[PDB]
Amino acid sequence: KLRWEKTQSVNVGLDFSVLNQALNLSVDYYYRKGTDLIGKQMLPLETGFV
Amino acid sequence: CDSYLDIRPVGSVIPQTAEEYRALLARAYLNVPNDRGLACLRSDEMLVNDNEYDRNSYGDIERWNDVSPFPGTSQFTWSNFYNVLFIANQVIESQKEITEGTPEVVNQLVGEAHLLRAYLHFVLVNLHGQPYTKSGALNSKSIPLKLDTDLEKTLGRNTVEEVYTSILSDIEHARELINKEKWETVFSYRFNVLSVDALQSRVSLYMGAWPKCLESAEAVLAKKSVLVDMNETPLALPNHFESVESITALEQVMGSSVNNAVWVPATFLALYQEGDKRLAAYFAAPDENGNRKSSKGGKREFSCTFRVGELYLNAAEAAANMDKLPHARMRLLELMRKRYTPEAYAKKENAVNVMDKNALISEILNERARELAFEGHRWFDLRRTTRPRMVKVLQGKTYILEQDDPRYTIPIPRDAIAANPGL
């Protein structure tokens, strides 16, 4: 069951230009939660491995 | 431009061929835990030495001290059991993928894996599960069955009926798959058809299914019934792997450390009546206290899982339990003649031939306790047969195991619960 490390991303953006490109603004708020990252876990002893 | 997704990494041994899977299964065979010796330490046939280091490890097991052992005491090996179970399940799931092997070799490998899994489940449910014959023990959760190689799931305890159904199914699978008649003497730890039938007989004996137990025992005896005659060689140990009686020599039941740390209590020796060559063959020189040491284990060449004498005892017990008294008597006196001095064999025959059902069954149980001494069989026989009240005197104290004590079931090891809190 080896597979890729999942990452759930939510991004909210905003672009805002005024006065003939006199002032440009780009704001992004992001929340990225990663799951199933491959790492060492202490398995139950019934799996055959510690 | 090139992609198939079929690439095997180079730099480590990845079992793919039949020889590689045979090596993996051989490593699984080697790591089979000998926890039946510790289980029979809980019985009445063993006494730990008066030492301190030798008693701080095995003292609490003998005293039935389930609550608050000494933290330095010996622990039953849950991890080894389930590691060998993982290897067996890996071999089973790797069928139809084993390369460079005759079908009669791949089938034998898969059947050996099936029988090893069945035997490991049987030993685990015997160690940490209530006896099959006990009332109200059929629906009680005993051990988690390992039937896959999944590393991301937590297994819950299966009931005794489920475990025994799985054991019977695996025995049938091994019977359908195992095709080897006899292995080499040096490679006799592996399973063969006689091993399948002997394991089925023992399983059915422990379940109380006397018909199937008798059927399997008689099948083994028809295929092989040659014993070691004690009267022509007094120092001929029936459990030796090179003897003509051993069917499978998988597990050395008695480890070196445990065998070096116990005696045979004077009561068990007193159970051996005059004329038994087993008295002078199994045990060493008498000690001043009256309790002898043992010479049936402690080293690798005394490995024995099944042998023909156990099959005779199973057949006799099944025949006695199904009112087939002539058959039980015939098998019991055959074993006694193979074991007893022919002067005492006359008295044994005279006594046995007039026994009723209950006395006959008790006699076969006594002969089973005598024959399988220091073979990891007394504790499980006590659990399956009567659960008798036991009195143990140790260092001036008395320890009492009630009839049908809940302590007849060894608690699941502490490390197993620590890793898996749901046990």
Could you tell me the end-to-end alpha-carbon distance of chain A, in angstroms, rounded to an integer? 18
Among B335, B314, B306, B194, residue whose Cα is nearest residue B239: B306
CA distance A9 to A32: 4
Return the bridge partners of B48, or none.
Answer: B262
Within 8 A by CB and 6+ apart from B137, the residues are: B129, B130, B131, B160
Of B86, B144, B154, which has the smallest distance from its Cβ to A48's Cβ?
B86
Experiment used for this model = cryo-EM
User: Looking at chain A, which residue has its C-alpha nearest residue B145?
Assistant: A46
CA distance B34 to B345: 34
> In sequence order, which ranges of B231-377 are alpha helices (DSSP H)?
256-259, 266-271, 277-282, 308-321, 325-339, 342-352, 357-371
Q: Where are the beta strands (DSSP E) in B164-244?
A: none
Among B379, B115, B100, residue whose Cα is nearest residue B248: B115
Return the bridge partners of B398, or none.
Answer: B393
Is the alpha carbon torsion for B203, B207, B210, B212 positive or negative? negative
Suggest the residue from B79, B143, B163 to mutate for an interface test with chain A (most A CBs closer than 10 A): B79
Among B315, B39, B23, B34, residue whose Cα is nearest residue B190: B23
Please report residues of B whose CB lies closer than 8 A to that of A1: 150-152
CA distance B121 to A23: 74
Of A1, A44, A48, which has the smallest distance from its Cβ to B420's Cβ?
A44
Given resolution (angstroms): 3.0
Residues A49, B85: C-beta atoms closer than 8 Å: no
CA distance B312 to B291: 29
CA distance B79 to chain A (A): 6
Residue B140 near residue B108, CB atoms below 8 Å: no
Among B316, B338, B339, B313, residue whose Cα is nearest residue B327: B316
CB pairs A-B closer than 8 Å: 43
Of A1, A42, A45, which has the smallest distance from its Cβ to B82's Cβ?
A45
User: b/e string for B203-236 if b means 16 or more Cβ within 10 A?
Assistant: bbbbbebbebbbbbbbbbbeebeebbebeeeeeb
